[PDB]
Amino acid sequence: MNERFTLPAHSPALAALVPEFLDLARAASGERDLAVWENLTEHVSLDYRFANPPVHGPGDWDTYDSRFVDPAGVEIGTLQGTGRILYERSSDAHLMMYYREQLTFPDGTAQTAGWVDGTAILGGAWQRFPILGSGGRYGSMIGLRSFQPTPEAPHSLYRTHLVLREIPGGHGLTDPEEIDAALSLLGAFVGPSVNPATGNGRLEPP
Amino acid sequence: GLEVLFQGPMNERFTLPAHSPALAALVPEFLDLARDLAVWENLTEHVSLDYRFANPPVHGPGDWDTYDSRFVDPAGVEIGTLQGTGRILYERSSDAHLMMYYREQLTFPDGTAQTAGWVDGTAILGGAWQRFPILGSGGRYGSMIGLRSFQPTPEAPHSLYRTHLVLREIPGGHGLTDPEEIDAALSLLGAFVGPSVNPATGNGRLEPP
Ligand SMILES: [Br-]
Ligand SMILES: [Br-]
Ligand SMILES: [Br-]
Ligand SMILES: [Br-]
């Protein structure tokens, strides 16, 4: 309806996520089911593949398994992830990587995706991915995964938070295209710029 | 505190940028556009494409372009112009489609606007509609958001597009000035209209396809 302004049927379901996500930022300081796992130690086992070694660059990819351990030493959950180094930004040649992760808790599942700036994370910045719950008590939830690689061991130990909270009637997304759209919508708030304007009005490979 | 929505270490577990509420404000507005309002339906978009390859003959990552467009209404009046640029960046893991990122600057007699967003190169081929969010940048359009929708014409898919432009004022405006906020806004609205940047492959391995 309206060739002029055709938005997909799922648009209201995506839009509903945005006030919930901002409300989570204010409620995540202290009704709904709220899962907060603060100050986790994330033990990562990383398997990196090089396209054209010994240089990190486009075509590199990795898989990883994470165990999430709370300060009391208890495993609260696991994660399986995969990332691909995709391109260098036209503006400053930063390596842009995309990740997809599957989280497993004792009583359910959730997933993330998002962009990482290669330069930023080597400097010790926080990385943040939006979470959509996919099963168990998490299925009706949205949230945020925040990790910082420890300066001691930046590829094996991370400091990590996981925050998820129920939204009324749930996010209602099951189709992988809607889920991906939801993860991009929320990722806009927390993710790096994919390709800033260069100034010369040209997106040249650097 | 200056960069974040709620300052202090108690908010390290859920840190959003300070501009998050302005970004959120755009979503209801964007959804409302369907139903000061500038509309241009059934424009003929005359496109002068300048297309480069990196490993001809094959279409792949490193291919890029610049294009100049003229927007001509049905009566034959030039109502504005556009300068665009695009890059083929990678092949999706799932189905190997060529993912491209574009950035465009729109010039009208009475102001300016900008777009950015993803294109599935392997879907423009099928003559599907392409949609980019618009943010006003100056003059009449400075306070507006909108949508650019174009389809290459069958008889001339390299040089003539059928094009719609909708821009509408938000009261007090969108209140984005800095490239970081502009890019995030284009990315937030782009989630509704752009292609999936890398669908889950099923085998849990974003391996190069
Ligand atoms: Br390490
Ligand atoms: Br540019
Ligand atoms: Br405190
Ligand atoms: Br995957």
Automatic annotation (TrEMBL), chain B:
<dbReference type="GO" id="GO:0017000">
    <property type="term" value="P:antibiotic biosynthetic process"/>
</dbReference>
<dbReference type="InterPro" id="IPR041013">
    <property type="entry name" value="AOC-like"/>
</dbReference>
<dbReference type="Pfam" id="PF18678">
    <property type="entry name" value="AOC_like"/>
</dbReference>
<dbReference type="GO" id="GO:0016853">
    <property type="term" value="F:isomerase activity"/>
</dbReference>
<feature type="domain" description="Allene oxide cyclase barrel-like">
    <location>
        <begin position="62"/>
        <end position="167"/>
    </location>
</feature>
<protein>
    <submittedName>
        <fullName>AbmU</fullName>
    </submittedName>
</protein>
